[PDB]
Amino acid sequence: PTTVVLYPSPGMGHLVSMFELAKLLDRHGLSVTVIIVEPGSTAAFIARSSASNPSVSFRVLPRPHHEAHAFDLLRLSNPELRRFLLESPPSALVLDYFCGNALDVSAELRIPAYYFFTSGAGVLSAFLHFPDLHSRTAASFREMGSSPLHFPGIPPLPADHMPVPMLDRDDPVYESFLYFSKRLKEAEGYIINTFEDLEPRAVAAISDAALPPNYCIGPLIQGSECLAWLDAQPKRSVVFLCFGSIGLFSSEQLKEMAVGLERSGQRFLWVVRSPPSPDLERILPEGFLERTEGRGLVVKSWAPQAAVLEHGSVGGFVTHCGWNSTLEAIASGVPMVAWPMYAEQWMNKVFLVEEMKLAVPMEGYDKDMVTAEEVERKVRWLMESEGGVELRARTERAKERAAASLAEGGKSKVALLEVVERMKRG
Numbered sequence: 001p002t003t004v005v006l007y008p009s010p011g012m013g014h015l016v017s018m019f020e021l022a023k024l025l026d027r028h029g030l031s032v033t034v035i036i037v038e039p040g041s042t043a044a045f046i047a048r049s050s051a052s053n054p055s056v057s058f059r060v061l062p063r064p065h066h067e068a069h070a071f072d073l074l075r076l077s078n079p080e081l082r083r084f085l086l087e088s089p090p091s092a093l094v095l096d097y098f099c100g101n102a103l104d105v106s107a108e109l110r111i112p113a114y115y116f117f118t119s120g121a122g123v124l125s126a127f128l129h130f131p132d133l134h135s136r137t138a139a140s141f142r143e144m145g146s147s148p149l150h151f152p153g154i155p156p157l158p159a160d161h162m163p164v165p166m167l168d169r170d171d172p173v174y175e176s177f178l179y180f181s182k183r184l185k186e187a188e189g190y191i192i193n194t195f196e197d198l199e200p201r202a203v204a205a206i207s208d209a210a211l212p213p214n215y216c217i218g219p220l221i222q223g224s225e226c227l228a229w230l231d232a233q234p235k236r237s238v239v240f241l242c243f244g245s246i247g248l249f250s251s252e253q254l255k256e257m258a259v260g261l262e263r264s265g266q267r268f269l270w271v272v273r274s275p276p277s278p279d280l281e282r283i284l285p286e287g288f289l290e291r292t293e294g295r296g297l298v299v300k301s302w303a304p305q306a307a308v309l310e311h312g313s314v315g316g317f318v319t320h321c322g323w324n325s326t327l328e329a330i331a332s333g334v335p336m337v338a339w340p341m342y343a344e345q346w347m348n349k350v351f352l353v354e355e356m357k358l359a360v361p362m363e364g365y366d367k368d369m370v371t372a373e374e375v376e377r378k379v380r381w382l383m384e385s386e387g388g389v390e391l392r393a394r395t396e397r398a399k400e401r402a403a404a405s406l407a408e409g410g411k412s413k414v415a416l417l418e419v420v421e422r423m424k425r426g
């Protein structure tokens with residue numbers, strides 16, 4: 001039996017993503033171990049995973065910016081990783097973008113090392129060519145502001161739309177990102193949670209045979225109260241608003257969205273978290289819950305978004321453009337309004353709006369605050385306008401081209417099968 005070791009970077013988000021890949025490789029006959037470096041209870045995750053997928057093993061390495069402590073942990077983890085790999089060398093190693101230091105270990109032991117890139121191919125291209133651009137300027141991306149950055153196969157990118165940890169060149173975390181992007185070029189191959197029919201130009205631009213190959217296997221996709229509420233509403237009539245894992249708005253900004261949602265007159269399901277420093281009556285405009293009881297439902301902190309997006313009553317998604325939320329909207333054919341917030345979401349927004357044309361922006365996301373007028377305008381536009389009809393049509397195409405890529409013979413199933421064979425023969 002051929003054995004694969006998958007190495008996510010610390011963080012429940014990275015672990016959940018990498019586990020989805022572990023279940024696939026296992027499905028197709030590989031013997032999978034996931035390496036854990038600890039920074040929402042890893043222990044509970046390992047217990048549930050072992051009960052549901054016993055063939056996937058876990059190995060927890062002993063302990064030696066918000067990404068900055070992760071980067072230190074990973075570096076000081078190379079000795080423990082080395083030893084576990086010396087015990088039983090595997091046929092192949094699968095790394096996270098943040099796990100570049102492990103390429104030291106994988107080269108010494110002559111182990112084929114693949115990256116699992118959990119964002120799209122457009123982002124990979126930007127991340128591939130960032131060190132090049134770094135040598136060609138002295139300015140910070142923050143100093144450059146709206147000056148466009150030109151990377152292969154993707155729209156121009158305003159330099160302040162680069163990821164927040166990369167905005168100030170005079171910081172150690174900037175240097176680590178430069179470091180991880182360079183080491184991208186030492187890979188055997190790139191496994192990407194995208195499908196080729198979604199980002200053709202991007203997939204072409206990186207398949208230049210002066211770079212490792214790449215395999216497009218996605219979309220890889222990962223309570224009772226609001227699902228009930230949705231049942232009681234007509235088909236395609238609800239606007240779903242949900243802003244990722246940590247997303248946070250100020251009470252002032254929450255008041256603008258409330259006013260805009262109310263004046264749009266549309267039905268809504270809105271996930272609200274505590275502002276950065278949830279008490280809905282203290283935070284929301286007075287009488288807003290009373291007045292909209294009936295048309296809208298506000299849920300605190302967390303919603304079952306995968307189910308919500310699959311529900312037939314949902315007609316639209318105001319999203320922070322995280323890549324898991326974007327793939328889940330596409331697979332269910334839900335048209336989007338793009339309101340990016342942190343990590344690489346601003347970049348994702350550009351690709352979504354101008355390359356894929358699957359969303360329209362929420363103007364003001366780059367300003368101090370999105371206005372009530374704008375929230376109302378785009379909510380109306382999404383659920384009523386002929387432009388909204390045109391957009392659903394492109395989202396409908398995307399749903400079918402995604403579902404097709406995953407069915408037998410489709411382009412994702414064949415890309416999966418192709419890399420499995422290549423690890424078996426490693």
Ligand SMILES: O=c1ccn([C@@H]2O[C@H](COP(=O)(O)OP(=O)(O)O)[C@@H](O)[C@H]2O)c(=O)[nH]1
Pocket residue numbers: 013222242243244245246247271301302303304305306321322323324325326328343
């Ligand atoms: O209330 C919420 C918010 C998020 N999610 C899930 O959390 C993930 C968010 O991943 P994404 O990459 O979109 O955003 P990030 O984690 O970077 O905030 C997705 O699977 C969502 O469906 C969820 O289930 N409920």
Ligand SMILES: OC[C@H]1O[C@@H](O)[C@H](O)[C@@H](O)[C@@H]1O
Pocket residue numbers: 013014015017118119322323324343344
């Ligand atoms: O592993 C996937 C993780 O990678 C990051 O690049 C994303 O911003 C997160 O949304 C995600 O949880």
